[PDB]
Amino acid sequence: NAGTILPETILIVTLLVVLLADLIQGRQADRWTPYFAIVGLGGAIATMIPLWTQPATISFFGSFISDHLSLFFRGLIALSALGTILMSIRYVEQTGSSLGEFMTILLTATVGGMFIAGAQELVFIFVALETLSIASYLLTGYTKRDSRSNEAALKYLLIGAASSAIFLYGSSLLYGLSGGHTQLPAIAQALSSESLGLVVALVFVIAGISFKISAVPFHQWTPDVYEGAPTPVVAFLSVGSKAAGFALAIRFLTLAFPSVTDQWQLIFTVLAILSMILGNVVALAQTSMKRMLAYSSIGQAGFVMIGFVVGTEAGYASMLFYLLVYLFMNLGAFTCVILFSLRTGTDQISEYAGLYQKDPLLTLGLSLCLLSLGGIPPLAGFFGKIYLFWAGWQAGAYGLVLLGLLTSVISIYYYIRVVKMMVVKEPQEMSEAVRNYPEVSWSSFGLRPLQVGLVMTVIATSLAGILANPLFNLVNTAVWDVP
Amino acid sequence: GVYGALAGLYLLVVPAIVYAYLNARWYVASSFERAFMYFLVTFFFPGLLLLAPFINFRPQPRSLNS
Amino acid sequence: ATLTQTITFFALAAAVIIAALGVVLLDNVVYSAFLLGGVFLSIAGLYILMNADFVSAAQILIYVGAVNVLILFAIMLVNKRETYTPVPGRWLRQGGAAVVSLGVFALLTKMILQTPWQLSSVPPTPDSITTIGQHFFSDFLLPFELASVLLLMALIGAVVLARRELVLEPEPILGEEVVPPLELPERPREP
């Protein structure tokens, strides 16, 4: 029955081959070992297309399901680590770190998140959440001599292992309210009473579900992890470690708690009406680009919950598609921050000022991924937000879309401010790259994976809204397996 | 545990035989007798520990015939 | 013969909560770290009282014998004899944590008592090393194979974050603009 975890066991083989080549060959292997992880992750995507037409089996004695939604969220998490290896092939190879030991942790957090999206038992959720979270503490402090990644490794551990203890306390009561029954469909037939034990079991699990996605009372690690961590890790913790948290929020709250359902549509409303506020107004007074993109992803996590709390077939399909186009924006925004940080140091805003005549592939690249996050037409993040507010307006929720619109205008102001300080600043107002840009080459080690990692996202940013009718049918067909 | 029948066979009467055996053939015993000699002490040790300060192995006084 | 299972419960339940206050409130951290074995042994005493003979024998091995030895090495490595005792650092935010911890405790006790549990009067543990091992290879198989992937990653990561950089500490590898060795290239700068 183990043909359904075949996308992950191509990554577990690939986890060992890119590790064993590090011990055998030893940093002469980094010339070829990043391209084997690409054909392992791409080989993991390529074998779900035989599995997409399969009739959604429940394998491994009820501990793992292979439904249509579990095939979808296993696609984005492998694709985000596909986009990260395209960035990190020069970045961490420029730090002086061994490149084989970085990918062995990153392709373990990838297999962690692929096993959350299809998990069905209370123990397999927790272990798969742990191996994504344990590998995420090691990546954020991986540079190990920075005095910023050291203090960002520890801020993520004393909250992550804390919230993995709150999450276990809600998993344990959920085993205790039912008479045993650690599987998630076996739970929901056993508890229906909506007592006080079920509510404490509900808030304690969405203190760990809504920590990966950084809802705003639990958002505190994200702006302090994201400016300390190495930047390709940040590119995975904003797309991969959020699609993994948004996949758990649908596999848990629609399976374990369908009896209590007016409450986790009300708690996630207060996480939605408050992460759109504090994600967007606090990103105004941020100087660093890696800290501006930190408060964006808190606020961009607030737009996804608008499709979550409404509870319709167009509701969940609107939050699946918005993550599908959010992968084409943060991996094209963080590609350009990396590409700017490798050429010159201190990649912060008010040092981008004076571009557009020195590296105009970056400036055209970074603009269409920052403008689309603010939702201007015709890019992907305009068509992504329209289907949110078409989903919010369909069934109640007249005030959730309106808060998602007055704060979609404040989001315009801090994305434009980078686009202002790239294309409108005259050649008498540039601070760095005052003839200090390195006279661009795209010929060194790993720069050509970065150039193909940016062009295939900017093309996938601008054209994903015009060509959205394939993706709207791929996503609406993944929702009929959600109760 | 037997009260006084089989206990005295282990504690007293057989370890008193070994102490006669230990005095006679200890330094003049062969390479095979010496390894068997260490086994009876490592087996009757709670017996041989009782009658320990009653027997003294000090050598007999010589006669000075010269 | 049954009251000696109640007296040994409350003598173990008071062995943990006086040691759990010891690992938190005590003024010295080595006396705090050694009492953590008192928590882990006394909790292992409760697992035998709850008919969990294997989970107790697996807890003295890991928590007392491996984790607590890992804690004690990681405290003899950092003493440095510089405590600096700045106790009134900024504010009295150690009383605000005493309200949330007392708040969660009074919250959980109201949940525990009033919730009807469906406790069964059947005899447990038919040799719970045989029915715990027929779970590892039928139902809990994929968490058992992922525990191997988690532990291998936890050895790759914990070695490269704690080992000594005696390979090449002064290594200027390359450059477009300057980057220090084993550091992220975004240099710190204040606007």
Added chain:
Amino acid sequence: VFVLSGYEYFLGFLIICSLVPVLALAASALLRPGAWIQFNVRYYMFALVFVIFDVETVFLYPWAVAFHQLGLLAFIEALIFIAILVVALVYAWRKRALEW
């Protein structure tokens, strides 16, 4: 209910062997009259490889006891657990972790 058999003598023997030091140190109590260790990270590194391998041993003890009542498919599956954690062992030798 307490359906463990054989633990009646474990609580008595826990107290009596605990009364071996506390009474003998009291039986002796009535009869008697530039400080640096160097921070060398090998005491941590030898103990980390213990925790990863003290947990591997725990996971194989339900397998070893209930082996000859499970079969071959539970031996292929239990070989993946050993063969992966061998790669953890080769990683510790090669990266000079347990060198001392």
Added chain:
Amino acid sequence: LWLPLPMLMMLIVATVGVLVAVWLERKISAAVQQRIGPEYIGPLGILAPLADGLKLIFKEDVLPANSDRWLFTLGPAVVVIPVFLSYIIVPFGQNLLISNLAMGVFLWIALSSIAPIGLLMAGYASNNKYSLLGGLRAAAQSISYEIPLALAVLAVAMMSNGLGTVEIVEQQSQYGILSWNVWRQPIGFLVFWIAALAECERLPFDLPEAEEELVAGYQTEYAGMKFALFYLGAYVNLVLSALLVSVLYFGGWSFPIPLETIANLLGVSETNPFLQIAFAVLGITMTLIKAYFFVFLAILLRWTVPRVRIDQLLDLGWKFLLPVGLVNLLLTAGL
């Protein structure tokens, strides 16, 4: 006050078992240097374990100057309580067992893991520089030889279909000497025997400091009754580890029909009163004939090998005894 009869009869044979192993150390190690050994006390040295331990009581067990007080005293009481609790496993005799725990060769490896903390809270608390260097080294030696020793017991638990130490030695009682586990596990026994010797014996231990990497080890600042627990508590584990060799691999209380000639390590005639008590106590204790061969071996193996340094002591446990411990477990399985 120990109203269990089996629990007092075990505490004596765990007490006289020490004084055998102390006396056997001072006579085997004096035989291999061609000297007498301790004469002049008892008959021929029998009261040398009594009198060496009785003088440790009558000395001023004084502390050093600036030391921790509660961890100095609790130092030896964590080394010796789990090696005294784990005598509850060993079932010497056919008609004797103290407690039939449903595990117990896993409870022994669990309880033997607490002893690195006892070398840590004694090396730290004695509070000089050469006991932290010796305490952190003695703690990092029971760490490395513990995973090989726990995988030797994994193999002999695969063959035995359980962890109950009566059910292990009952699988070797059907053919006497043909079904001892040494003949079926000849490579997992040396893994047990080298690792058990490297956790309690006196060849791979830094306490005699003739090499001067430290001052005198971690038990340098200890005296008196506390030192008697580090000294007469090391042979408690030498006997128990030698007992569990002769319980797991070599069959405890298992042997064929005794009706033989006079060459059976006994007297001369067939049916004497001297062989009926050399049989009936052997029908009570058969294992401490076998268990005092490895104590005889571990003392004799001390003078056979050279003193291997700590740089090559942990290059034996991790790099040799653990990979052999793995491939023995697969070979004990099918593969």
Added chain:
Amino acid sequence: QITNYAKEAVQSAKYIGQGLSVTFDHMRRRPITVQYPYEKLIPS
């Protein structure tokens, strides 16, 4: 591999076997020792 650890160890598993029987054959010899209060040694 699986074809080395049972042949790269017999290089010293049999050196102790020719070191054990040497030291065990010191026990067969007569203990050369001069017990003082009972066998005093005659001076020159």
Added chain:
Amino acid sequence: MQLTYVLILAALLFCIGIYGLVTSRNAVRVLMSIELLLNAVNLNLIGFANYLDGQQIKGQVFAVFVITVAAAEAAVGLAIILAIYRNRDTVDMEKFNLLKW
């Protein structure tokens, strides 16, 4: 001892771990105070397995995986403190507030 008295023991063992998670000033005492939380979710878990679903223990299997995660989270967890101590030569959680705003 019934089922209820194990849970109030586990609910009290949790909240001493919370109080150490927030108040403790040593960087290592927060790691020991995390381990108290990962025992209170074990004492809750076996106690839910003895009185509920006693015949097939699904809790004592789930009690095994919590120990192996927390042993792997404290092996990772002390590697981080030992990377900080080589850069910042103290362990003081009121000294790691340099990523302020």
Added chain:
Amino acid sequence: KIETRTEPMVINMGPHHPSMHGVLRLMVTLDGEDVIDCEPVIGYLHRGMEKIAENRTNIMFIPYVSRWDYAAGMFNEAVTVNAPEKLAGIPVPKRASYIRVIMLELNRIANHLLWLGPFLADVGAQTPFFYIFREREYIYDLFEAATGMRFINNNYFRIGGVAADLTYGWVTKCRDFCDYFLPKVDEYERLITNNPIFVRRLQGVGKISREEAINWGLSGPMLRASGVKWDLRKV
């Protein structure tokens, strides 16, 4: 109380020093595993020997002299009586000249047998320590016959030769010993030359070249193991 700092750790080797070569004090300092500095504090056994010798006659000084090289003994009495017998021109009888050579070569055998005991214990094997003092008591009882003491304090060398001639059953008692001991020199050579652990403790350990071992001022089997072949008996 002890703290764990990142400085080089300095340890004191102690003048207690449980070994058989006297009392040094080495303040050696460690850098993890490799030592980086080491000062010897010596003079713990300075009993004022050059100040004694200004207030003694010669025959009052020969009991004092076998305490400098007290492993040897009469290697030091040879130098003391050779101070005025090589200066006043006192002729030595040739039988005494061949008697001295027997004693000085019996001392060098007893000299290398005291070095070898503690040295083999330092590098490994601990049980050949007791089988080597057993070979040393044969040389003691040979000195005990001719001279009235075992290894030191034997006023045997005089300014005019030697003190007294040998005993009666003496030359046939070397021929027992000095033809029994020579199979055992080839026994101690096979402990270290074979058994490839002890050569993994001595190959390259404490190396010095020829030109620095002559410059530092070295003699005897520290100089001759530096490839110098300077022996003062031939020179």
